[PDB]
Protein backbone atom coordinates (compact mmCIF):
# COMPACT_ATOMS: atom_id res chain seq x y z
CA UNK A 1 0.00 0.00 0.00
CA UNK A 2 1.99 2.89 -1.15
CA UNK A 3 0.21 6.11 -0.20
CA UNK A 4 -2.32 7.38 2.22
CA UNK A 5 -5.58 8.86 1.00
CA UNK A 6 -6.06 12.57 1.25
CA UNK A 7 -7.33 13.46 4.70
CA UNK A 8 -10.97 14.27 5.28
CA UNK A 9 -12.09 17.80 4.42
CA UNK A 10 -11.64 20.35 7.24
CA UNK A 11 -12.79 23.48 5.47
CA UNK A 12 -15.80 24.07 3.26
CA UNK A 13 -16.98 27.66 2.83
CA UNK A 14 -20.21 26.54 1.28
CA UNK A 15 -21.32 24.14 3.98
CA UNK A 16 -23.96 25.45 6.43
CA UNK A 17 -22.20 26.32 9.63
CA UNK A 18 -22.91 27.82 13.04
CA UNK A 19 -21.26 28.59 16.31
CA UNK A 20 -23.55 27.12 18.89
CA UNK A 21 -22.95 26.82 22.62
CA UNK A 22 -22.82 23.06 22.23
CA UNK A 23 -20.25 23.22 19.43
CA UNK A 24 -18.13 25.65 21.43
CA UNK A 25 -18.29 23.20 24.37
CA UNK A 26 -17.33 20.29 22.14
CA UNK A 27 -14.07 22.13 21.28
CA UNK A 28 -13.26 23.87 24.56
CA UNK A 29 -14.19 21.09 26.94
CA UNK A 30 -14.76 17.77 25.25
CA UNK A 31 -12.07 17.58 22.60
CA UNK A 32 -9.53 19.33 24.77
CA UNK A 33 -10.10 16.92 27.71
CA UNK A 34 -9.82 13.92 25.44
CA UNK A 35 -6.73 15.31 23.75
CA UNK A 36 -4.75 15.17 27.02
CA UNK A 37 -5.64 11.56 27.82
CA UNK A 38 -2.75 9.08 27.92
CA UNK A 39 -4.43 7.06 25.25
CA UNK A 40 -5.26 9.98 22.86
CA UNK A 41 -2.17 9.92 20.64
CA UNK A 42 -3.27 7.30 18.04
CA UNK A 43 -6.40 9.38 17.49
CA UNK A 44 -4.78 12.81 17.16
CA UNK A 45 -4.23 12.66 13.38
CA UNK A 46 -5.24 10.52 10.46
CA UNK A 47 -4.00 6.96 10.50
CA UNK A 48 -0.69 6.91 8.59
CA UNK A 49 -1.14 3.51 7.06
CA UNK A 50 2.18 3.84 5.15
CA UNK A 51 4.22 4.42 8.32
CA UNK A 52 2.34 1.84 10.30
CA UNK A 53 2.57 -0.77 7.54
CA UNK A 54 -1.22 -1.27 7.39
CA UNK A 55 -1.80 -1.53 3.63
CA UNK A 56 -5.32 -2.90 4.27
CA UNK A 57 -6.45 -0.15 6.62
CA UNK A 58 -7.98 2.09 3.89
CA UNK A 59 -9.35 -0.97 2.15
CA UNK A 60 -11.50 -1.61 5.19
CA UNK A 61 -12.05 1.87 6.51
CA UNK A 62 -13.82 3.96 3.89
CA UNK A 63 -14.91 6.91 6.10
CA UNK A 64 -11.72 7.82 8.02
CA UNK A 65 -11.99 10.17 10.99
CA UNK A 66 -9.68 11.35 13.80
CA UNK A 67 -9.55 14.01 16.48
CA UNK A 68 -7.08 16.14 14.56
CA UNK A 69 -9.63 16.41 11.73
CA UNK A 70 -12.38 17.07 14.25
CA UNK A 71 -10.36 19.74 16.00
CA UNK A 72 -9.73 21.48 12.65
CA UNK A 73 -13.43 21.22 11.73
CA UNK A 74 -14.39 22.75 15.04
CA UNK A 75 -11.78 25.55 14.66
CA UNK A 76 -12.99 26.21 11.09
CA UNK A 77 -16.66 26.31 12.17
CA UNK A 78 -17.44 23.41 9.82
CA UNK A 79 -20.47 22.08 11.63
CA UNK A 80 -24.11 23.20 11.73
CA UNK A 81 -24.82 21.50 15.08
CA UNK A 82 -23.22 19.40 17.75
CA UNK A 83 -24.75 16.21 16.47
CA UNK A 84 -22.74 16.47 13.32
CA UNK A 85 -19.57 16.64 15.43
CA UNK A 86 -20.67 13.84 17.73
CA UNK A 87 -21.18 11.71 14.66
CA UNK A 88 -17.57 12.30 13.62
CA UNK A 89 -16.37 11.13 17.09
CA UNK A 90 -18.58 8.05 16.69
CA UNK A 91 -17.15 7.35 13.24
CA UNK A 92 -13.63 7.58 14.69
CA UNK A 93 -14.38 5.05 17.46
CA UNK A 94 -16.38 2.75 15.21
CA UNK A 95 -13.54 2.67 12.66
CA UNK A 96 -11.17 1.48 15.37
CA UNK A 97 -13.61 -1.27 16.43
CA UNK A 98 -14.08 -2.36 12.80
CA UNK A 99 -10.43 -2.61 11.83
CA UNK A 100 -9.34 -4.19 15.14
CA UNK A 101 -10.67 -6.77 17.60
CA UNK A 102 -11.80 -6.83 21.23
CA UNK A 103 -8.84 -7.10 23.52
CA UNK A 104 -6.38 -5.48 21.16
CA UNK A 105 -4.42 -2.77 22.81
CA UNK A 106 -5.72 -0.08 20.41
CA UNK A 107 -9.29 -1.15 21.20
CA UNK A 108 -8.71 -0.82 24.90
CA UNK A 109 -7.40 2.68 24.20
CA UNK A 110 -10.44 3.60 22.13
CA UNK A 111 -12.76 2.15 24.80
CA UNK A 112 -11.23 4.36 27.47
CA UNK A 113 -11.40 7.48 25.33
CA UNK A 114 -14.97 6.66 24.33
CA UNK A 115 -16.02 6.20 27.95
CA UNK A 116 -14.64 9.66 28.69
CA UNK A 117 -16.26 11.14 25.61
CA UNK A 118 -19.63 9.75 26.64
CA UNK A 119 -19.24 11.03 30.17
CA UNK A 120 -18.45 14.53 28.83
CA UNK A 121 -21.36 14.69 26.34
CA UNK A 122 -23.87 13.24 28.75
CA UNK A 123 -24.85 16.78 29.67
CA UNK A 124 -24.38 19.52 27.07
CA UNK A 125 -25.21 23.24 27.17
CA UNK A 126 -28.69 24.32 26.05
Ligand X SMILES: Cc1nnc2n1-c1ccccc1N(c1ccc(Cl)cc1)C[C@H]2C
* Interface positions with ligand X (CB under 6 A): 42-43, 47, 52, 54, 96, 99-100, 105-106, 109
DSSP codes, 56-70: THHHH-SS---HHHH
Nearer to ligand X (CB atom), residue 74 or residue 109: 109
Query: In angstroms, rounded to a whole number, what is the distance separating the alpha carbons of residues 28 and 30?
Result: 6
Nearer to ligand X (CB atom), residue 6 or residue 51: 51
Nearer to ligand X (CB atom), residue 9 or residue 56: 56
Q: How far is the CB of 61 from ligand X (least distance, A)?
A: 8
Q: How far is the CB of 96 from ligand X (least distance, A)?
A: 4
Cβ atoms of 91 and 65 closer than 8 Å: yes
Amino acid sequence: GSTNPPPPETSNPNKPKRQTNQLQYLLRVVLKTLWKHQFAWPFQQPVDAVKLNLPDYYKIIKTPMDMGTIKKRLENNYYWNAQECIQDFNTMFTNCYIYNKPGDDIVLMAEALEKLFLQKINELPT
